Amino acid sequence: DDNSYMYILFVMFLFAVTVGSLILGYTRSRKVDKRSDPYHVYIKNR
Amino acid sequence: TEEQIAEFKEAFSLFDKDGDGTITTKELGTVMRSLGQNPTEAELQDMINEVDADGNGTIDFPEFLTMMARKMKDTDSEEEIREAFRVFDKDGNGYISAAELRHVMTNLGEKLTDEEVDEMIREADIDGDGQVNYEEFVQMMTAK
Amino acid sequence: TEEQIAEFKEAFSLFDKDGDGTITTKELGTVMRSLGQNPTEAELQDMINEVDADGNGTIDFPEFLTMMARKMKDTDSEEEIREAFRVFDKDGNGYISAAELRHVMTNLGEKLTDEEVDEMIREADIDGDGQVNYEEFVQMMTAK
Amino acid sequence: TEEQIAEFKEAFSLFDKDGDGTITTKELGTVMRSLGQNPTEAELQDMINEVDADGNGTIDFPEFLTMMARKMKDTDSEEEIREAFRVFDKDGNGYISAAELRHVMTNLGEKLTDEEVDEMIREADIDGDGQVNYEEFVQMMTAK
Amino acid sequence: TEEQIAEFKEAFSLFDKDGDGTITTKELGTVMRSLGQNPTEAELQDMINEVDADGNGTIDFPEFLTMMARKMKDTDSEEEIREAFRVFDKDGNGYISAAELRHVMTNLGEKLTDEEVDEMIREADIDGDGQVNYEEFVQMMTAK
Amino acid sequence: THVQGRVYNFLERPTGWKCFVYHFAVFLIVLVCLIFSVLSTIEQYAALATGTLFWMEIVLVVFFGTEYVVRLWSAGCRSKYVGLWGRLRFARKPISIIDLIVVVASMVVLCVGSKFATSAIRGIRFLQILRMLHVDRQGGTWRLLGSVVFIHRQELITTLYIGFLGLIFSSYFVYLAEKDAVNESGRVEFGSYADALWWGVVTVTTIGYGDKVPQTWVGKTIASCFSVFAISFFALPAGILGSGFALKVQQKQRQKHFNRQIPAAASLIQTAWRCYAAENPDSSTWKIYILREHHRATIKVIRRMQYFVAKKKFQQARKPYDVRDVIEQYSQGHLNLMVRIKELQRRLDQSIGK
Amino acid sequence: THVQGRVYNFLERPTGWKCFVYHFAVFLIVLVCLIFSVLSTIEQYAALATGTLFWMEIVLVVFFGTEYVVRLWSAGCRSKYVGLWGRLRFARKPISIIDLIVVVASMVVLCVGSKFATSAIRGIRFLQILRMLHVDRQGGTWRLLGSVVFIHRQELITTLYIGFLGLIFSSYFVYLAEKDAVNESGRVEFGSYADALWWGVVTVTTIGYGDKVPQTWVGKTIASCFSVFAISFFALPAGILGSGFALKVQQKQRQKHFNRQIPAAASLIQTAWRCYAAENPDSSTWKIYILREHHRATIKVIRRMQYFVAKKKFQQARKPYDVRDVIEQYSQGHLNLMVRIKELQRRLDQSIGK
Amino acid sequence: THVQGRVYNFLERPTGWKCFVYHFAVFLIVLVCLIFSVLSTIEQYAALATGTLFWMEIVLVVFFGTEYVVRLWSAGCRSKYVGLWGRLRFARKPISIIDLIVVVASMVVLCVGSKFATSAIRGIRFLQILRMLHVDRQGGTWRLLGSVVFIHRQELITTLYIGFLGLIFSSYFVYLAEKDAVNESGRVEFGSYADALWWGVVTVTTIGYGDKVPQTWVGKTIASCFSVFAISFFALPAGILGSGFALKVQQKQRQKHFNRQIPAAASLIQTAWRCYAAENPDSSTWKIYILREHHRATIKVIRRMQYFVAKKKFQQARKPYDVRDVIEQYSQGHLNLMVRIKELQRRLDQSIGK
Amino acid sequence: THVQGRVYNFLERPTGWKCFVYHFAVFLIVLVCLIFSVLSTIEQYAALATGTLFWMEIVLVVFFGTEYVVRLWSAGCRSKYVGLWGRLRFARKPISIIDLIVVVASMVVLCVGSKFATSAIRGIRFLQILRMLHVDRQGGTWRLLGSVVFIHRQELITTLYIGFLGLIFSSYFVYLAEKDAVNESGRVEFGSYADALWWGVVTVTTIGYGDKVPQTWVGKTIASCFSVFAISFFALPAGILGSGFALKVQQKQRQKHFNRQIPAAASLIQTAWRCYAAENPDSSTWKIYILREHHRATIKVIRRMQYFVAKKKFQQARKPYDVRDVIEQYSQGHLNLMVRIKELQRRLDQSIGK
């Protein structure tokens, strides 16, 4: 078990990347197709 | 801001012509026929279904002021023009000819007036044997 | 039961106007023009192709009594209205504004009369700064 | 064989009415209006595009004699009628009611004459409380 | 080369009939009606949308000289005719009958004149009991 | 007659929740009998095989003989299974043959095994395994598989043919290259063609037990040369069938709904009857229009063409929506509209002049 | 009220970059705690399990108790979660139950393990593994899987049923053929049905460890007979689900965009309210048209039919584009145009004569 | 001439049941000869190789020489294979080259092996394996595979390029990490780059024999790093080709049926002949319309444009139904109808005035 | 200027057969250098590493330094790469960075290794492996993969998340069940969590080396419980990406061909220029129609709406054919035709009366 720890790290890192993209699937989920653009909300305020 | 949107309210009132608050297709067709353009009914409908967001078929005043507020200097609107020039780019190097551009602008699509093409050419860098770099010509009309 | 379906038979006989036993599109169009609605032919056809099940194009009497018997208090018919309100829900919390609802009901789709919207608003819980919980407003019209 | 195809040649000559050798849609429409049927142009076109194989739009004489030669006693043509009865089969057991069949034949699709439905019923085995086995009723019209 | 393209310029000037430099659908329809052909508007449009490459709907002079320059002796244009004969090839061996070809050419598609079919047959190798090898008949009209 | 149809609808074509409870409880009882018959193969639980394997099997075969008699009696509410030959046609459908084989084999084994006793227990275990095969009533699993296998049959013969052909060729090549190589244990690894063929079947389906691995580098070169190409050809049936199932599920969500085929189906019947009504000259079918001997010869032709059109429209009303539906209805609509504009023109001229 | 909605939108339904930093930093901290809790299983790093596994776990359970209290308080900006029963319905959704189980189990383990100490460390390791399961807020991963599994459910029961059925049959056949064969080491290879069933499960999913390989050629024949057929049936769920995901992605690029359902949705509300307005005779809904007791009986019918048409058009405005959309709008357009040409004909006749 | 066509249609392009019996019986005889030639590799059945392997092989090569002579003679009913060069073009198509190679190789081996005797038997076994390759007449299996491989060629070069690139890189990395590790038996596991490359090819296609497993954890880390990514890239050709086959089967059920291309194909011929008829001024093709030297110059142009339109419509009449068919026919129909309404307007004005 | 464009088109964006010969010959030379650098790892051919590995590497790095200088000079025919910053943007694209890293690393290694000598040879072997990565000019392989991975990204995060989550959970469960089991050789099989995690990664991707197999039946039960579910989730990316590639190939055969976007693209330019021409009041763009200060305020609005419509129609002219194209053109055609029938009615009334 000389360089054993590396293998554990290598699995968790990959899982981190997956969950990282998963959270980037939520926070950058813009959902452009509305009648409320941010510029359009700023115009509706005026 | 307010002296801008007052002028946009005046321009909206030029289209409205009553107290309805909406621009129908007939109220736009009468303006375009007073200018002498003779639009088709499908063209008048396509010009309104690009603008409105409620989907009812007319243009309200926040919908009218929204399209007049945002600048053409964007990422999508610049790249679409940069791609539209690449259709008329022989050899793909990023340069088009002067006579080729004058032939394209006065024949294809909307026939642009030759007096207007003479103005269009001299704004862009024409020196170098007739070649013109169209990317500066896109920077001229999108950033300004 | 029987005194209900006798009244539904009378209401069917108001549409039939002869001894045919069927409601054609013309026999419905004459009633809607006597009320003063002026329907399109495609609208008269869409109102009949939702009702009949034989597919022939007219409405028989069990087909007429079937749609008049079932209650709107269902699972599909409640959830479709609960979803139709969520289109007009800014911030998605389950509350819509009073002035926003008055603007939506009198402009979009079928223009609802302002005297009717004044009746529509006061039935629902309006107190709390103009916000209204529309889920109770769906319980009001589906369960009753 | 030859005395059959001579009669089919006579029946073809009733449709041809000139020396063209082809049956157009007008030469079929005039026969169906002399019988008093009033066909639509799309119906006259659908009746010819089922028959011809050259795809030109008219009916030649081998194409006319081909459809008159083959018998309805087949595998496809029997199974399609056996499946068409199963639409009107409540409980799927292979028996339909007499009053239900009389109601279906005189209302849906082509309105069959009540004097013809009275002939249609008594050919089939009606005894047993109004139920009729339609598979023998398909054997009656396909095998004969 | 130049005495060829001068004749093609003369043939273009027969279609142009003004100083526009373009062949519209009306300028082609008038020529085809002066010959006595009576084309449909969709046929006049299909004959022009096969030729032009700018997509504007008219035919310029390099577009007109391009289609008149290339020879039918190709790889695609030979194989399409070699495949079009195989539709009318019973048993697929590469031989078609004389009477069958005379019946096909005078009935299906464009009705070819019988005086023209009499010229069409005798150019090809007809000896051998009425059979004709159509691959030599494709070599005759594509290579020449 | 009513009770016969109700117990037919209960035993075959199930619906409801009570009938779910019935079929799933019968399956659960026969699977518990399977587990208690299977656990006796373990050396610890070998004492369980003597008692409960006889006097529960006889009760279960009484129950599955009684249900078969009740179902075969109750299959007479259908029209096609009536009388002696109807019951004989009900008894020759495949799952009924499976159930009959199970009940007669359990009777034979319980008659023989009551008086050797190990082969009796072995037959009981095989019948307990086989008895779960008739839980799938209606054959809805096997028919769904058979349809998708039949539609994709040419592309499923292609890959299997190329895969088995490569298997034969390279199993012979690896046998030629490795027939004298010696394992590290000392044994000759590939000693026959069946040996290299077991190697090939273990390799191409990506199991790779590792009991037989080629030793010399000529064998490893041929083994990789074959493995890289042929593993895709033995993996293609899963891809073909899976994409076929998914395209069929996508296709069944666009569908001409049921009322669309109701006036078409009736229109198939009437016209067909009218053709059958044509040959009797004294029928009442000649009284629609209101003298003969040549009108009848053209009415027969028009009725046969109407029958063909009605059969075509009934076949179209059962398929899902497609592009030729749009093309067909636009052709019909533009044809009718062009005829009516031609009519308006034909009246406007000669109503005025010029 | 505003701050309650803002911290609800921050904790659940995330958006922005700051909220990405929050959720991903919390996940990264709990995964670093997982790695430092897992590395103590190695014999070299076993000295790390004593110190940092208690006084970091108590801080992490304080942080995940506080976040749960804040989220459950802040779920009151929604309409459906208001009051006691609203909070109780927020607390019975599945990921909230997972988070509650995690925080109460960590409290129980840190109360027991402070006074045996190995089972405490084992419970801490299992909770560190379980605590990553509530990083997926909104359940957007599990719902996307569940939809595609539910749509393709019949074709996914079919292949699993045939695969397990073949597994049972051939595991018994290979047990029958190999129950007396002796390994080269000398041990009996297949000694029970569980033994041959472990062989079957290792074989059909193409793992093939090679610890259990059949020895006699009858067993190898049955093993190949089963392997070649059943490996495709255990590989079909990947093909079915993968082609279902790809067809769904292709379907969502053709889509009726958002404004199309705005005048439809309002048209569902008004008509529905008009039906509810029909039963009160003194409403202002009877004042659109401008005497009674039979006009009302037909206005109720017309309003119910208009409600059904509006509900149908709202259901159509949410689906993607399809062939029946083209067929429906061509039917409506050709119907209106044919009516208008009929109108022009009806006026041109009797405006002139003939 | 008739009998030549009938025996051509019997030997190549089979149809019927008698011709099925012929081809399948010939295949079954050559496969029984294959099995009795293959079973001699087993040590028990080695006595079968002496007798029946010569005096059945000579009869089978007489039968496959006679069938080749009869087929090559009978290929003269086709138009393209007539005369010496026609037979020479029939003899250079690939399956005829395969059959010629088989018959001349069996003649060579039976001439050499009649006077060493083991290499004769080895050549006989390889020819018995090769002789099943020309049972697929018409090449309908290989052409169906080749079409789908050619259509999906860019996406099938992409995954193979990335997969082999990852294979080279990580086989070198695992060789670097494991070149001094010692197996439990004591041997050096990875001793060269060919050794690690055999490991990589066994790993990426998910065989995993387990003869070569990396020992140190650096090697296991690199091995998993490579395995997880590259197994999908070596499994993608099965998914691409399987979904391509299933989409092609779905595409061929929507199809312009045969009569649709009959008046188009004739319209390709006439117009083409009319172009060829244009260059002879004294033809009868100038007599359709009923003086020259400029009408001819425009008739040639109109005939060439009609030829191009006819070729386009013949190419459209062979493809399946698609969206551009709907768009094209709506453009044509709306254009004609708008022209006719314009005509009615142009007559109604100036028939009245205003 | 012309020669600069010609050698740019020769080195990058290849076409012809001579340029195929150039690029494929350069690739073939560097792969022959790779093979002769790799064969020295075998103990037999270790004498080849001394001579040809230095004085061929220096010639190859001279050739790949010269080609990089020529390509970076010749990238000035493009518009975007002109001047100092243009060359600096050409030098920071990824394959140019790869080529620069290769040439400077070969210079460093040949400077160090000329004066230890094993690490020099190791660096030379790694550079010979890396030097094949810039044969893919234009990045046409990686971009095609990246597009399909990006479109299917949510469904490809879903299965990987569920697969790794199941991997973590069941690797811990199998570690708990097998941490004291002893192999037949006598060694402890699963000794840590990294050990069970290597087991899990070998199992779920169906390699199954068989070096680590769980011993007790609790471990085998958990191992099958996990294997059966998670192998499909690690096999789903191949199915998703393969069906995505096949649907993209099917999509690109229906396509709006090139001339369709020629009058649209020009119509995007003119209108855009007209918007830019609106702000200068003394332009010649106000002279189309043939007094002011309110006509200009509405001409600017009409020109901006025409620009938006032209941009929408240019975006539509690049997509393949779809159902919304049919719906859009039928809406436009029926709208124009209904307006013209309304016009004919409006003239026929009041041309007559009534």
Ligand SMILES: [Ca+2]
């Ligand atoms: Ca207005």
Ligand SMILES: [Ca+2]
């Ligand atoms: Ca609006």
Ligand SMILES: [Ca+2]
């Ligand atoms: Ca009536």
Ligand SMILES: [Ca+2]
């Ligand atoms: Ca009805």
Ligand SMILES: [Ca+2]
């Ligand atoms: Ca005629």
Ligand SMILES: [Ca+2]
């Ligand atoms: Ca015909």
Ligand SMILES: [Ca+2]
């Ligand atoms: Ca002109």
Ligand SMILES: [Ca+2]
């Ligand atoms: Ca042009």
